[PDB]
Amino acid sequence: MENFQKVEKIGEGTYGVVYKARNKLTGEVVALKKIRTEGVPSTAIREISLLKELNHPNIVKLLDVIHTENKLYLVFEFLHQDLKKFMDASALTGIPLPLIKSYLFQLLQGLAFCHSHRVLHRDLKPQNLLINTEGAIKLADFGLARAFGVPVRTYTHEVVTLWYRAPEILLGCKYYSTAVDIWSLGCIFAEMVTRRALFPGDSEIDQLFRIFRTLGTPDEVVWPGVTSMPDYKPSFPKWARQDFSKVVPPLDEDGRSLLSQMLHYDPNKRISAKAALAHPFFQDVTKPVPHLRL
Numbered sequence: 001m002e003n004f005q006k007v008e009k010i011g012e013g014t015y016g017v018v019y020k021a022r023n024k025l026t027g028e029v030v031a032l033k034k035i036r037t038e039g040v041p042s043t044a045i046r047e048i049s050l051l052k053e054l055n056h057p058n059i060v061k062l063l064d065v066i067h068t069e070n071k072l073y074l075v076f077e078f079l080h081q082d083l084k085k086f087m088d089a090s091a092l093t094g095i096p097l098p099l100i101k102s103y104l105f106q107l108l109q110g111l112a113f114c115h116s117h118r119v120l121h122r123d124l125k126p127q128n129l130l131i132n133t134e135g136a137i138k139l140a141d142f143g144l145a146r147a148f149g150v151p152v153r154t155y156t157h158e159v160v161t162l163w164y165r166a167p168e169i170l171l172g173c174k175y176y177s178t179a180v181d182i183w184s185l186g187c188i189f190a191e192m193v194t195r196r197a198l199f200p201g202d203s204e205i206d207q208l209f210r211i212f213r214t215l216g217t218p219d220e221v222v223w224p225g226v227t228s229m230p231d232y233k234p235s236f237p238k239w240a241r242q243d244f245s246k247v248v249p250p251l252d253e254d255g256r257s258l259l260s261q262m263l264h265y266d267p268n269k270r271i272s273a274k275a276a277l278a279h280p281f282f283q284d285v286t287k288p289v290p291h292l293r294l
């Protein structure tokens with residue numbers, strides 16, 4: 001705007017443009033997010049203003065929420081790399097399990113905190129997870145779908161990723177549950193392990209059918225009420241669930257068990273972030289430091 005000398009465009013947020021900027025008056029480097037118009041709900045945004053009070057080591061600190069010119073500016077502490085770039089960087093050898101384990105454990109702590117404060121992220125994806133040289137990983141973005149929602153793209157015609165979207169969202173559920181974040185983190189967990197997106201759908205139905213072909217088409221047995229969902233069709237194909245051992249090798253049984261619980265069809269059966277933190281997969285969790293190329 002003026003108190004900020006844009007350094008580089010960090011990228012394209014699903015609400016606007018994110019810039020790496022420097023506070024010309026404080027000298028601190030931050031991530032500046034400019035929001036997409038004709039006023040925007042001032043009562044809805046209050047949520048955001050409440051997010052400044054959500055302080056946790058695994059959540060990106062929201063330093064400021066500014067309203068001026070129908071442009072909403074969000075100032076976040078700046079982190080040097082997102083998880084997608086890091087995974088791509090490690091694609092050849094894979095992220096080491098101890099690090100995968102540490103990031104998973106930290107993201108769960110972050111989610112446990114948000115969920116206990118009644119905040120849902122709703123759009124977890126590798127690109128929204130930020131890491132530093134210290135070995136920490138933080139939740140960035142946060143949907144803010146109740147105070148904003150999901151556009152016909154993001155802010156300027158851009159292919160929204162559906163890969164980490166929970167089945168109840170794909171089936172037209174209106175009320176989000178904190179369980180949707182768990183599903184997404186589960187997908188991200190499998191992705192770090194295998195170095196392949198778990199459910200790479202390029203359309204809502206393709207996304208849904210990819211989930212079904214892998215976990216089996218859900219029914220009233222495994223998911224009471226599923227046939228009552230808004231977009232459920234009795235015409236959906238009936239795929240048998242695939243053996244889970246083929247889904248995430250060579251993840252051990254502790255990891256597979258935790259993953260199956262994070263990917264339970266029924267949201268009420270899906271494990272919470274708090275219980276997952278107590279899962280035996282984390283008995284030997286540590287905090288390695290990643291090899292970061294900045």
Ligand SMILES: Nc1nc(Nc2ccc(S(N)(=O)=O)cc2)sc1C(=O)Nc1c(F)cccc1F
Nearest residue numbers: 013031033076077078079080081082085140141
């Ligand atoms: N605070 C913050 N720091 C970032 N750093 C950063 C990100 C990616 C790379 S990369 N691609 O690895 O070179 C480097 C640095 S993005 C970001 C944020 O909060 N971002 C942000 C936002 F403002 C609103 C919605 C989603 C977001 F991810």
